[PDB]
Ligand binder design. Structure first.
Ligand SMILES: Nc1nc2c(ncn2[C@@H]2O[C@H](COP(=O)(O)OP(=O)(O)OP(=O)(O)O)[C@@H](O)[C@H]2O)c(=O)[nH]1
Ligand SMILES: Nc1nc2c(ncn2[C@@H]2O[C@H](COP(=O)(O)OP(=O)(O)O)[C@@H](O)[C@H]2O)c(=O)[nH]1
Ligand SMILES: Nc1nc2c(ncn2[C@@H]2O[C@H](COP(=O)(O)OP(=O)(O)O)[C@@H](O)[C@H]2O)c(=O)[nH]1
Ligand SMILES: [Mg+2]
Lengths: 436, 372, 48, 426, 106, 42, 425
């Protein structure tokens, strides 16, 4: 029981899976070739790997995840690197060609002739384990496969399963800083068709975590490997309660019932408080009463939307490590008693607490330090209404003279799809300001 | 992490079968967790357990995990076998007929050097048992003298737990001739308590095969006991049992010393690790006459106890006054020279249990030396 | 590779609650006999 | 004789029940294997109140454990006292409640109610004469608030004369643990009134105030809180299983507590509670347990009694005491502060004295009190409910499971009458 | 209640007892003044050593007595009884001095 | 100002949501505590 | 007949800590709470000051209240400081800052509700209350601010009992605080109205009696605290030990207070010798009663030469005969007739106990209600009017809930009380 299936779409999703699964193989004793060490284990009895690994006859722990990328070029390395004996060979699905920053190519033309194979593999994964709790799909927004093929899979997963959980992380474009020119098109077209097929989307940007790797980790000029390990750290701290004992356990069907008031308001941003270096932790004591406060700092937060101007709607504190409930409740009362955290008038409760009994694990090579306390606040706030406004202002600028449209309408896409996508994104912007 | 895995075996009294298990000790974060071999599942989660210690984990040891007398049979892995088999080595520690009187110092030096007692009993060797003993010494010069020396008086054989136990006990023994130990390598027990080269103080093996053969001669595997017990079922016979609390910190040798100093002599001795169903078949006469009884009864099956026979030869002071009051504070206020006044404390893990009723001295000695 | 952070020792099973409800006055009559003066005894037999 | 059937709904109820069967096994001397190992002969002659046994003299608890998830059932089964429980007393489902009053009560819990009714009624019939039912569950959750609410709904459907005892773990005033807790609190309290005879409300920040201000602990975990709750809650049924001078079962308590059947919300306490370094300078007499029980810092509902007069009071006593001193203390505390007691009842205090103190104590007590000032808690839950529900904010988590919209209005209006019809009778 | 009574661990019940062994975390920076106060296990008490000033550590007189156990003169035991009886003779009271027995007290 | 009576224990002061620092990402409003990195023109 | 003890401020806490020394070695109470005395008399009336708990440990009826957390450490780690009840240790976080405003009006309003609970717990568990004892310093911010607040809040709750205040009056030579007169005149306004008996202590008189009488070399604060504790334990000695005559804590009030607002006393302690010259003194009643009425054997800076006595108390301790006691009182009245008022024929009140202090043979204790105490209040008025005229240090008070008119009302009652003391001479 207590199982989870992780879906890894796109370059961002398939490079996150090369670092989050390193952490997964490091929490338990999983060697990079999918086995326990020489003995270093019992003759059976342990079942904490049941959520993410499947137990076979010879003792191999095969992950229950699917790697999908229309580009072959990135999955070629997870199948040839140091983790080539861990992944099941048919869990790594690749095709002919990439989508090349096109929603149309990943959604209509090249999307269809791989969807059936991916769904067959999801079927083969689902009957392998009895009690399935939900799906953890990670992809991107500015690309072509993470934006198109993943959004095509949301339609194929909400009909076959129904009431299963759909949790998103979904690498989101940064405000000042971008990578591709046409990415407002793909971002709007993938937020138009993924509204009623998901219920939790944990937005992060690649700029705020760059600034965080300049805050706390004492590194200069980081790269994506210093990014995906932090992402996978918060991923494992979200689902730490399924496999480890604790005081207040939180399952996968809990974030929807708390963080989602309205079906169109399901975008809680994440935050990992005790991001720190080993040197910077040598002069600070890691207590509950500052990791509680570090989550509400604009410095430690994700997407730079200035949450002083926002209104908090629903928070979900997931504590980890050496924690007693007394200082947790004292710190929560402290941060409640302060005025500068604006809370909306119709949520007098506002908090959800989950306490585990396991300290986080550290990786050899990551600049994160060994600590005793860790939280991950998935906070839902109105401050991302500015994010959508500055995201679709770029579409308003680009669509005003029909730039880059001929690559879309020339391949399986209709001209009327753009207008209704901007229209319902405007509806999503309109309903966000009437909840404040 | 760095957990230590053991294969366990618990006998269910309700269903007549043995249930195998798997206990995991975590040093530092002192805690246990339990797993099941047949019917693969978990039994006890990660709970911090305070009564389990690293010195109490070895093959053949009875341990108490939440009121269960589970036995240890083998290491779970080859990591724990590597990280414990180099520090858990058994060798025979024999004591010749001399320094049976001077036996407290032998136990004191053994306990001071980092050894652990698991098994102990006091016998006399018959003619055939002392002829199979000294088999390498056959048709050598001094055979009759050693044979008639071994068959003279009582023999105390005990076990030894230490890393590199054989070589360390041979170092502690010194050279076999007591003159060489007196001259060349002094402060050894052969220098201290040996007189001749025949009249040695103690003897042990040199290798593993000789130690195993000596072990099989002296202590058969289960059931049949080889030698006798030398129990002197006389009128002036009483009992005293040393609680595992006293044997854990090496108070056994000092107990023997201060018993021999008062004039009382010991006729029999044996190391026991009794089950719950036998001690709660021995101590339920104290049901209701004592203030606390459940922790008193689980204290003395928590480890190995030394049950011995002691005779009253000191005039005008019986042994029941030599041990003293049951409450050690009444002993320390009233009779500062008694056994509980200077050895035991806290009224539950006191030093020894002397027989309260002078009519009942043959019954409990009888029980300990024929029933078990 | 060192544990950094202020360690708060705590017991999760609840042994602190078991100890704190044992009322440390007869916890020590279990491990001895209390020794009060004797003049106070002859007072307490006579005006108590 | 007077058997009690125990119910444990939800993960909070499972934790409290695990700690309770840890602590009450020490009163009767039950080891985790199941055999009996005690000091006195008095702790086995009333084993029928809580324990059933089998062939071999090993005693199993008469408790039925229910949770929709099987997760906490592994925590209960693999604890120190996880083998005495019956293996088929663990009923469980395939999925979770997610802190919803709809999912554990109408759709998924509606399959599990019949499963726990399979075992509960059999365990009811095998007793020669039942006393009643006892429930430990949470209110702000979904499994305890949804499964056990239908349970106490359809136990009185076929056992209308037994005493219903619940241990309502009520949400805290300031700090919250679930965002949708006012829904699961109001919708469970609305069904609490029509189907319960005795309800005691236990908070969590009040336990915190106990453990930090009157016990002086630095790190209070949930094991300590569960042990305090179980020590309070093993004190009500003392005379049911130990002899004394003025005995009292659950029915006698419930007769002396409630004057009207809509008014059965009580508020507990526990007298010998002082810091472990402060036990040297405090004597153990009745005129100090009486002082502690009436202090504001020894009451688990965290409602100030200055805001409402008591209706009826009960004080179960343990230990060899003098009844004369107890009557003196009760009369004096009723006469000194006459402004905090009602006038239309002559004697507001019921006194029951057992003879056997808890192990590790020489004198203890348990305080169960019906108070008007428990309306302050319902006022907070009503304020949260009318703040959140006022334009059908969270309707969509309570429409997809078949709950109707007017059910909220009924669950408010039939719970607001616990305030309008609570000050007239005061 | 003298120097020789100040040595035996079960001291006679007229000598005061030492305040118990405590570790100290002064307030002065910490949220709570924690004190691990060891309670000696009955028979292992201690005769009281420093009633002169603070038991904390220190900060010009005798806190203990001056007759150190190293040197000799503690003799003249008839001599020291007289003041013990004389302090006792100050605590006799008027009614017990006059209306006790068959008349006043010699 | 200073003539207003307040209990000195109730003076904890503003918490973790009063100040933001300026970004390291971009020459526009760079915080003066870190490397600026060059900003080459045409 | 039991007494609940209170102590506020650092000076009051130290004075109480030295008073419990004398009490606990008088009754044979061990520094840990056990009993080690010899006589049965110590255990007879041990319930006057002490409480019996299980284990036979005896604990005082003292409530520990102040504002400054570091004076915990000067009490708990004291020589006899382990016997105190830890639940009676209540005080707040921030310091007093030597302000009457901070200790009485704004910060102290949140501590009084918590210290009255401990006072209720200690006083309501008695069989018969008799009164309250308070040791405090009039010049501080805690003893002078929260002391009068506690007296005000206690007088309403228990109006039919008596009050004892042992107030350290400001001295001009020992000037250890700049804001001394402001705290002086803000304290005795609320001390005159409700408190029925007040023992005034001056530090310069204590230094004078440690220099000229005891001939001490280096007198620290410990010697002065010992002297004020010797006075403290001598006024309630009839409550704790039998004697040939009785004076409980209300007979002193009835004998010594003839008019409601004339209840300020001059305490004293007679049998004080030189340091090494004890061999040359005859320990007789005439010698001690001649030293007792001597001017420099007082504990207040005001000279009895300049005024006239109203009432005089004398609490003797020891097995002395009554003939020399009452004859010597007759003598000291007959030859000092100009220094006693003519409208009261007998001006002395005598009492005899039977237990002398530890380390003595016979002792007395002088308490004096005289009109010579007006000079001390007069110099307090001059020090107040010098500062207040130019509004010198007013902005640390008026910034925390004060008016100007409160100070003028305090001064008005000051010269009013001086006028009533002067008018009867
Ligand atoms: N945080 C993080 N972001 C990544 C990573 N890899 C790619 N991205 C983001 O993804 C964008 C690159 O385009 P992708 O969407 O990943 O490309 P794709 O998913 O393969 O889609 P196509 O390129 O059209 O095939 C960049 O703008 C990054 O912001 C990664 O490893 N970590
Ligand atoms: N006292 C106590 N309360 C608990 C414990 N576990 C959970 N709770 C309370 O239960 C409430 C939430 O219940 P929940 O976890 O949702 O129960 P569920 O419906 O079965 O999932 C919280 O407000 C907690 O205060 C415990 O071990 N002890
Ligand atoms: N007799 C005596 N007086 C003291 C002692 N300590 C301080 N004082 C006096 O008390 C005054 C200080 O008052 P203080 O207690 O510090 O102010 P508070 O804390 O606000 O009450 C000074 O003028 C000192 O002369 C002492 O140990 N004995
Ligand atoms: Mg791609």
């Amino acid at each position: 029981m207590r199982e989870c299936i992780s879906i890894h779409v796109g370059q961002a999703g398939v490079q996150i899976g090369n670092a989050c699964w390193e952490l997964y193989c490091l929490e338990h004793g999983i060697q990079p070739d999918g086995q326990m060490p020489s003995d270093k284990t019992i003759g059976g009895g342990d079942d904490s790997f049941n959520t993410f690994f499947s137990e076979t006859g010879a003792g191999k722990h095969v992950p229950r995840a699917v790697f999908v990328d229309l580009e072959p070029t990135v999955v070629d390395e997870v199948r040839t690197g140091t983790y080539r004996q861990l992944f099941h060979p048919e869990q790594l699905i690749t095709g002919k060609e990439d989508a090349a920053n096109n929603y149309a190519r990943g959604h209509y033309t090249i999307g269809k002739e791989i969807v059936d194979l991916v769904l067959d593999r999801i079927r083969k994964l689902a009957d392998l384990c009895t009690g399935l709790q939900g799906f953890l799909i990670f992809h991107s927004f500015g690309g072509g496969t993470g934006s198109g093929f993943a959004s095509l899979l949301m339609e194929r997963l909400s009909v076959d399963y129904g009431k299963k959980s759909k949790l998103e992380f979904a690498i989101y474009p940064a405000p000042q800083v971008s990578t591709a020119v046409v990415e407002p098109y793909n971002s709007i077209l993938t937020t138009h068709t993924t509204l009623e097929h998901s219920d939790c989307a944990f937005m992060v940007d690649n700029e705020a975590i760059y600034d965080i790797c300049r805050r706390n980790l004492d590194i200069e000029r980081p790269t994506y490997t210093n990014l995906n390990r932090l992402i996978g750290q918060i991923v494992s701290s979200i689902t730490a309660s399924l496999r480890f004992d604790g005081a207040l356990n939180v399952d996968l069907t809990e974030f929807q019932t708390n963080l989602v008031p309205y079906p169109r308001i399901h975008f809680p941003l994440a935050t990992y408080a005790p991001v720190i270096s080993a040197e910077k932790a040598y002069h600070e004591q890691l207590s509950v009463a500052e990791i509680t406060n570090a989550c509400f700092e604009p410095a430690n937060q994700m997407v730079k939307c200035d949450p002083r101007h926002g209104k908090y709607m629903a928070c979900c504190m997931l504590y980890r490590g050496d924690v007693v409930p007394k200082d947790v409740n004292a710190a929560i009362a402290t941060i409640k008693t302060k005025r500068t955290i604006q809370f909306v008038d119709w949520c007098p409760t506002g908090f959800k607490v989950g306490i585990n009994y396991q300290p986080p694990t550290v990786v050899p090579g990551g600049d994160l330090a060994k600590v005793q306390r860790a939280v991950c606040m998935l906070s839902n706030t109105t401050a991302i209404a500015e994010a959508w406004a500055r995201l679709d202002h770029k579409l308003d600028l680009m669509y005003a003279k029909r730039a880059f449209v001929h690559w879309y309408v020339g391949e399986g896409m209709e001209e009327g799809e753009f207008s209704e996508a901007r229209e319902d994104l405007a509806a999503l912007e309109k309903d966000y300001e009437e909840v404040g | 992490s760095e957990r230590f895995v053991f294969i366990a075996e618990w006998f269910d009294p309700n269903a007549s079968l043995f249930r195998r298990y798997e206990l995991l000790f975590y040093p530092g974060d002192g805690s246990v967790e339990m797993h099941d071999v047949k019917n693969h599942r978990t039994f006890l989660k990660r709970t911090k357990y305070e009564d389990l210690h690293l010195e109490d984990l070895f093959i053949g040891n009875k341990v108490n995990i939440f009121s269960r007398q589970l036995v240890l049979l083998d290491y779970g892995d080859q990591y724990t076998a590597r990280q414990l088999g180099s520090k858990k080595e058994k060798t025979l520690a024999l004591i010749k007929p001399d320094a049976v009187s001077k036996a407290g110092e032998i136990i004191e030096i053994i306990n001071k050097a980092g050894f652990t007692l698991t098994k102990l009993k006091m016998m006399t060797l018959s003619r055939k048992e002392a002829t199979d003993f000294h088999i390498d010494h056959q048709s050598r010069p001094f055979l009759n003298e050693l044979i008639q020396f071994i068959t003279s008086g009582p023999i105390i054989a005990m076990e030894i737990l230490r890393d590199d136990a054989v070589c360390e006990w041979k170092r502690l023994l010194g050279p076999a001739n007591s003159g060489l130990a007196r001259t060349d390598a002094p402060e050894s027990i052969r220098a201290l308590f040996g007189t001749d080269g025949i009249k040695n103080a103690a003897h042990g093996p040199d290798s593993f095969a000789c130690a195993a053969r000596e072990m099989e001669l002296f202590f058969p595997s289960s059931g049949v006991c080889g030698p006798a017990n030398t129990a002197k079922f006389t009128n002036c016979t009483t009992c005293c049992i040393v609680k595992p609390h006293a044997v854990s910190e090496g108070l056994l040798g000092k107990i023997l010393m201060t018993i021999r100093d008062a004039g009382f002599e010991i006729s029999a001795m044996q190391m026991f690790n009794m089950d719950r169903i036998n001690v709660e078949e021995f101590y339920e006469v104290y049901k209701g006459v004592v203030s606390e009884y459940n922790e008193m009864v689980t204290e003395m099956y928590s480890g190995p106890c030394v049950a011995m026979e002691i005779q009253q030869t000191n005039p005008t002071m019986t042994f029941r006054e030599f041990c003293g009051p049951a409450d050690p504070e009444i002993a320390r206020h009233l009779r500062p020279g008694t056994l509980r006044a200077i050895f035991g404390k806290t009224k539950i893990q006191n030093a020894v249990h002397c027989t309260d009723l002078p009519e009942d001295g043959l019954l409990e000695v009888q029980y300990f030396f024929k029933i078990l | 590779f060192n544990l950094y952070g202020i360690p708060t020792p705590h017991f999760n099973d609840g042994r602190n609650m078991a100890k704190t409800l044992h009322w440390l006055h007869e916890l020590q009559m279990k491990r001895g006999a209390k020794i009060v003066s004797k003049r106070v005894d002859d007072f307490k037999e006579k005006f108590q | 004789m007077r058997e009690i059937v125990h119910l444990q709904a939800g993960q909070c109820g499972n934790q409290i029940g695990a700690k309770f069967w840890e602590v009450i096994s020490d009163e009767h001397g039950i080891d985790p294997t199941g055999t009996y190992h005690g000091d006195s002969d008095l702790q086995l002659e009333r084993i029928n109140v809580y324990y059933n046994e089998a062939t071999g003299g090993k005693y199993v608890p008469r408790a039925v454990l229910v949770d929709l998830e099987p997760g906490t059932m592994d925590s209960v089964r693999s604890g120190p006292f996880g083998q005495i429980f019956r293996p088929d007393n663990f009923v469980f489902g395939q999925s979770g409640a997610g802190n919803n009053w709809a999912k554990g009560h109408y759709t998924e819990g509606a399959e599990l109610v019949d499963s726990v009714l399979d075992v509960v009624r059999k365990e009811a019939e095998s007793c020669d004469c039942l006393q009643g039912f006892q429930l430990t569950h949470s209110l702000g959750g979904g499994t305890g608030s949804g499964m056990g609410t239908l349970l106490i709904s359809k136990i009185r459907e076929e056992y209308p004369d037994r005493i219903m005892n619940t241990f309502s773990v009520v949400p805290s005033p300031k700090v919250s643990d679930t965002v949708v807790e006012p829904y699961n609190a109001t919708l469970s309290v609305h069904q609490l009134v029509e189907n319960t005879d005795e309800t005691y409300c236990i908070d969590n920040e009040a336990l915190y105030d106990i453990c930090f201000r009157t016990l002086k602990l630095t790190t209070p975990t949930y094991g300590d809180l569960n042990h305090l709750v179980s020590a309070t809650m093993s004190g009500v049924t003392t005379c049911l299983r130990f002899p004394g001078q003025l005995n009292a079962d659950l029915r006698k308590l419930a007769v002396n507590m409630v004057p009207f059947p809509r008014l059965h919300f009580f508020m507990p306490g526990f007298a010998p509670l002082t810091s472990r370094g402060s036990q040297q300078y405090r004597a153990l007499t009745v005129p100090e347990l009486t002082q502690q029980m009436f202090d504001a810092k020894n009451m688990m509902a965290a409602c100030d009694p200055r805001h409402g007069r008591y209706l009826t009071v009960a004080a179960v006593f343990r230990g060899r005491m003098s009844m004369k001193e107890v009557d003196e203390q009760m009369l004096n505390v009723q006469n000194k502060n006459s402004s905090y007691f009602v006038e239309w009842i002559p004697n507001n205090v019921k006194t029951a004295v057992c003879d056997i103190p808890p192990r590790g104590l020489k004198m203890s007590a348990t305080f169960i009190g019906n108070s008007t000032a428990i309306q302050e808690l319902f006022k907070r839950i009503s304020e949260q409910f009318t703040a959140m529900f006022r334009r059908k904010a969270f309707l969509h988590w309570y429409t997809g499971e078949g709950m109707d919209e007017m059910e909220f209005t009924e669950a408010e209006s039939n719970m607001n009458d616990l305030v309008s019809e609570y000050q007239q009778y005061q | 209640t003298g120097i020789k009574a100040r040595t035996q661990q079960p001291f006679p019940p007229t000598v005061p007892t030492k305040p118990y062994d405590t570790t100290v975390l002064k307030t002065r920076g910490n949220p709570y003044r924690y004190e691990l106060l060891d309670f000696p296990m009955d028979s292992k008490k201690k005769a009281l050593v420093w009633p002169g000033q603070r038991v904390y550590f220190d900060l010009k007189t005798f806190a203990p007595n001056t007759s150190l156990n190293s040197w000799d003169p503690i003799t003249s035991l008839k001599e020291v009884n007289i003041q013990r009886n004389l302090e006792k003779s100050h605590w006799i009271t008027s009614y017990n001095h006059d209306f006790t027995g068959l008349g006043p007290m010699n | 100002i200073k003539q207003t009576p307040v209990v000195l224990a109730m003076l904890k002061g503003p918490g973790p949501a009063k100040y933001l620092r300026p970004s390291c990402t971009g020459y526009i409003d760079h915080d003066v505590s870190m490397f600026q990195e060059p900003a080459y023109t045409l």
